[PDB]
Amino acid sequence: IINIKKEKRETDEETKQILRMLPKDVSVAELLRELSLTKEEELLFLQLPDTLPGQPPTQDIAENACTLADLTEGQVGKLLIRKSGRVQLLLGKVTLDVTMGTACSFLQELVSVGLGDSRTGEMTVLGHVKHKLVCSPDFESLLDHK
Amino acid sequence: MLLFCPGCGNGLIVEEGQRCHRFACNTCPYVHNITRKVTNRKYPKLKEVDDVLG
Amino acid sequence: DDPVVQEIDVYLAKSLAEKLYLFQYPVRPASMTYDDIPHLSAKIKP
Amino acid sequence: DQEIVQMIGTEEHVMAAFGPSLEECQKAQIFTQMQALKYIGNKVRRQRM
Ligand SMILES: [Zn+2]
C-alpha cells in the first residue's frame, strides 16, 4: 500500500490511524525555537487590527482606516519579547500585543497569483502556512495613558 | 470508526473487491485495500455491581 | 518584564500587494500536500 | 461530509452520535447541493395556491 495516500482519521492532529510499527505553544517560545533552535525561515499569517496607529500618507484622505495598503516600504515597527511571556509590537508611539491565533491543522498554501498579462497569468506557490498570529491594541495602556 | 475519502471528503464504507476487503466511497472511484488488522474498540461501561440497601 | 531578547524588526513590502492570494483547504490536512499532484489549469475572475 | 463532521465536533462520542445521521444520508442518493435542494422542495407545500 502507498504510504502517502492512507486513510485519514477525523482528528487532523492524529491522522496516523495505522503505523508502520500536542501542548498549546506560546508566541515567545515559538519565536525562540524558530530562531534559536533552528534557522530555517517560516511563513506566518498575522491578523492586524482594522485601523493602524497612523495616517494615510498623501492618499487624499477624515480619520479613515489606515491599512498596510497605504503605508510604504521599510521598517514600520519593532517586535519586543519581554519577560514572563509578553510579546508586544511597537508600531510607533503605541504598542500592540501579539497572541497565538486558532491552531489550524488543515492545509494552508500561501501562493502568489500574478496576472502579468491580460490573457495569461502565473500562479506562484510561495509556501505553506502553519501558525496564525493575532495582533490587538493594548486597550488597558491606552486607557491608563489618558 | 468513521473514515473519509481524501479525494472528496465523503464517508467511506467497507465492501469486498476482487482480491480483498476495501474501503470505498460512493461518489468517486477512490478505494483503499486493507493490509493488516483494523479495530475500533468502544469499551462500554460495565454494569456496576449494585449493593443491597436497608 | 523588560524586552530582554528578540528585538525583531518589521518590514513592509508592496510588490505582491495585489497578486497575493491565500488558498486553504478545509478538507485536506496539512500533512498531505498537493505538491506531487500534477495540476492542469486554473480558471479565475479578477 | 468531512467538513460537516468537523463543524459538528471532533470528539469521539460526537462522531459516534452523529454516525447514524451520516449513514441515513448515505442511504439516499443525496450528495450534491442540487439534489438536496430538490429533496427539500419535494417536502415543500404551497401556501394554498
Ligand atoms: Zn470519496
XYZ file of C-alpha atoms and ligand atoms in Angstrom:
296
model
C 0.000 0.000 0.000
C 1.141 3.564 -0.710
C 2.320 5.341 2.437
C 1.419 8.916 1.410
C -2.217 8.156 0.485
C -3.532 6.263 3.513
C -6.946 6.917 5.012
C -7.116 9.931 7.323
C -8.561 9.891 10.830
C -11.124 12.529 11.783
C -8.628 14.184 14.141
C -6.346 16.170 11.830
C -3.635 16.204 14.517
C -3.814 12.386 14.836
C -4.389 11.231 11.254
C -1.908 8.367 11.845
C -4.572 5.699 12.252
C -2.222 2.957 11.008
C 1.528 2.980 11.637
C 4.472 1.066 10.206
C 5.273 -0.294 13.684
C 0.247 18.451 21.315
C 0.594 21.101 24.026
C -0.545 24.632 23.233
C 2.557 26.658 22.389
C 3.145 30.351 23.098
C 4.365 33.070 20.743
C 7.522 33.837 22.744
C 8.682 30.211 22.813
C 7.505 29.903 19.199
C 9.841 32.662 18.004
C 12.595 31.406 20.322
C 12.557 27.931 18.769
C 12.149 29.458 15.300
C 15.355 31.498 15.713
C 17.486 29.823 18.401
C 16.641 26.139 17.924
C 16.620 26.427 14.119
C 17.484 28.932 11.397
C 15.013 27.870 8.691
C 12.594 30.555 7.533
C 8.887 30.274 8.312
C 5.739 31.744 6.765
C 3.315 33.279 9.271
C -0.202 34.699 8.941
C -0.906 37.502 11.426
C -4.183 39.410 11.735
C -3.679 43.157 12.164
C -6.402 45.436 13.558
C -8.793 47.310 11.293
C -7.047 50.676 11.749
C -3.316 51.074 12.300
C -1.991 53.909 14.507
C -1.084 56.088 11.531
C -2.335 58.400 8.804
C -2.580 57.654 5.061
C 0.433 59.481 3.598
C -0.806 61.836 0.857
C -3.587 59.400 -0.059
C -6.303 62.083 -0.458
C -7.815 61.394 2.988
C -11.015 62.281 7.743
C -9.782 59.772 10.348
C -10.444 56.902 7.946
C -8.969 53.406 8.128
C -5.181 53.189 7.742
C -4.168 49.745 6.480
C -0.952 48.319 5.043
C -2.031 49.340 1.524
C -1.361 52.990 2.432
C 1.971 52.542 4.219
C 5.256 52.473 2.313
C 8.136 50.002 2.444
C 10.906 49.956 5.039
C 10.966 49.458 8.782
C 7.475 50.133 10.156
C 7.737 48.692 13.675
C 9.641 46.514 16.110
C 8.802 43.215 17.814
C 9.595 43.069 21.538
C 9.647 39.908 23.665
C 9.535 40.809 27.358
C 9.850 38.550 30.389
C 7.095 36.207 31.628
C 5.992 35.577 28.036
C 4.928 39.064 26.941
C 5.034 39.554 23.156
C 4.456 43.150 22.059
C 4.628 45.014 18.742
C 5.852 48.621 18.937
C 4.344 50.291 15.854
C 5.336 53.818 16.864
C 4.032 55.602 19.948
C 1.592 52.802 20.819
C 2.333 49.127 21.472
C 0.040 46.270 20.467
C 0.192 42.711 21.801
C 0.612 39.553 19.711
C -1.080 36.299 20.727
C -1.485 32.887 19.133
C -4.486 32.507 16.852
C -6.656 29.481 16.234
C -4.433 26.438 15.754
C -5.250 25.444 12.181
C -4.484 21.857 11.181
C -5.778 21.826 7.590
C -3.616 22.665 4.589
C -2.974 26.380 4.013
C -0.847 27.234 0.965
C 0.290 30.835 0.553
C 0.566 31.387 -3.206
C 1.190 34.368 -5.481
C -1.268 34.781 -8.367
C 0.377 37.332 -10.643
C -1.598 38.408 -13.720
C 1.333 39.674 -15.754
C -0.696 39.611 -18.977
C -4.389 40.290 -19.543
C -4.722 36.808 -21.097
C -2.163 34.606 -19.297
C -1.066 34.823 -15.672
C 1.262 32.951 -13.336
C 0.400 31.274 -10.030
C 3.449 31.014 -7.756
C 3.229 28.774 -4.685
C 5.222 30.797 -2.162
C 4.967 28.363 0.741
C 2.812 26.754 3.412
C 1.055 28.449 6.338
C 1.146 26.643 9.690
C 0.755 29.162 12.535
C -1.587 32.136 12.888
C -0.930 35.262 14.960
C -3.368 37.889 16.248
C -2.312 41.491 16.914
C -4.544 43.512 19.223
C -4.437 47.036 20.668
C -3.359 47.183 24.310
C -6.537 48.971 25.353
C -5.578 48.956 29.041
C -2.441 51.020 28.391
C -4.317 53.320 26.001
C -6.868 53.949 28.760
C -4.443 54.452 31.654
C -2.346 56.769 29.464
C -5.061 59.430 29.165
C -14.517 4.204 13.153
C -15.538 6.966 10.734
C -13.243 7.323 7.717
C -13.424 9.796 4.841
C -12.058 9.824 1.308
C -9.039 12.137 0.855
C -10.326 12.964 -2.630
C -13.785 14.410 -1.988
C -14.300 14.009 1.774
C -17.341 11.722 1.727
C -17.798 8.837 4.136
C -16.079 5.543 3.342
C -17.894 2.207 3.533
C -16.438 -1.307 3.705
C -17.004 -3.538 0.673
C -15.438 -6.609 -0.936
C -13.477 -6.255 -4.164
C -11.894 -8.894 -6.366
C -8.915 -9.568 -4.070
C -9.658 -8.271 -0.573
C -11.961 -6.160 1.567
C -11.532 -2.451 0.889
C -12.785 0.940 1.982
C -14.610 2.727 -0.830
C -16.508 5.949 -1.480
C -19.886 6.105 -3.215
C -19.097 9.258 -5.240
C -15.559 8.630 -6.550
C -13.505 5.642 -7.769
C -11.194 6.012 -4.769
C -10.564 2.740 -2.926
C -8.196 1.519 -0.220
C -7.324 -2.139 0.312
C -6.919 -3.469 3.850
C -3.426 -4.801 4.574
C -3.322 -5.544 8.321
C -5.909 -5.842 11.088
C -8.003 -2.752 11.856
C -10.004 -2.469 15.079
C -12.226 0.112 16.792
C -12.953 -0.589 20.451
C -15.576 1.324 22.419
C -15.134 -0.029 25.972
C -18.768 0.048 27.155
C -19.444 0.928 30.776
C -19.618 -2.170 32.963
C -22.844 -2.836 34.834
C -21.678 -1.720 38.270
C -22.397 -4.422 40.837
C -25.299 -2.864 42.747
C -25.328 -3.127 46.542
C -28.072 -4.177 48.955
C -29.916 -1.351 50.718
C -31.646 -1.119 54.089
C 9.394 42.494 32.459
C 11.790 44.271 30.105
C 12.358 43.311 26.448
C 15.468 41.264 27.200
C 15.831 39.472 23.847
C 14.322 39.089 20.373
C 14.014 42.707 19.225
C 12.842 41.711 15.755
C 12.244 44.374 13.112
C 9.102 44.560 10.967
C 9.359 45.460 7.273
C 6.632 46.117 4.705
C 6.516 45.093 1.039
C 4.115 46.291 -1.666
C 5.413 44.195 -4.581
C 2.740 41.479 -4.279
C 0.011 43.598 -2.677
C -2.470 42.886 -5.491
C -1.109 39.463 -6.529
C -1.107 37.615 -3.176
C -3.905 35.109 -2.544
C -4.447 32.706 0.355
C -5.732 29.225 -0.518
C -6.836 27.000 2.371
C -8.294 23.506 2.028
C -10.792 22.872 4.864
C -10.945 19.147 3.989
C -7.224 18.497 3.410
C -4.950 18.148 6.466
C -1.618 19.959 6.464
C 0.255 16.634 6.408
C -0.756 15.752 2.833
C 0.005 18.438 0.244
C -0.740 18.885 -3.459
C 2.940 19.213 -4.403
C 3.049 15.823 -6.158
C -0.408 16.155 -7.770
C 0.029 17.418 -11.367
C -2.279 20.373 -11.959
C -3.814 21.128 -15.353
C -5.482 24.556 -15.265
C -6.991 27.286 -13.096
C -9.996 29.399 -14.050
C -10.252 32.752 -12.281
C -12.009 36.125 -12.464
C -10.354 39.439 -11.495
C -19.262 15.017 4.841
C -15.824 15.503 6.417
C -16.416 19.256 6.655
C -19.825 18.608 8.229
C -18.276 16.300 10.833
C -15.517 18.824 11.565
C -18.174 21.511 12.053
C -20.205 19.286 14.389
C -17.208 18.298 16.512
C -14.074 16.162 16.656
C -14.859 14.317 19.900
C -15.167 10.537 19.662
C -18.601 10.474 21.308
C -19.744 13.270 18.977
C -18.816 11.214 15.912
C -20.392 8.109 17.461
C -23.651 10.009 17.982
C -23.590 11.636 14.530
C -22.787 8.369 12.726
C -26.425 7.318 12.253
C -27.225 10.641 10.569
C -24.374 10.190 8.084
C -25.488 6.609 7.432
C -29.089 7.672 6.801
C -27.866 10.411 4.455
C -25.677 7.937 2.551
C -28.638 5.550 2.251
C -30.240 8.089 -0.086
C -28.589 9.381 -3.262
C -28.266 12.950 -1.931
C -24.656 14.053 -2.465
C -24.804 17.490 -4.151
C -26.451 20.812 -3.374
C -28.900 20.459 -6.273
C -30.108 17.025 -5.138
C -30.587 18.227 -1.557
C -32.447 21.340 -2.728
C -34.718 19.180 -4.892
C -35.380 16.842 -1.954
C -36.250 19.837 0.232
C -38.520 21.328 -2.432
C -40.334 17.998 -2.671
C -41.105 18.451 1.044
C -42.428 21.994 0.455
C -46.158 22.703 0.241
C -47.614 25.791 -1.416
C -49.318 28.345 0.837
C -52.726 27.392 -0.586
C -52.200 28.295 -4.257
Zn -14.585 9.917 -1.858
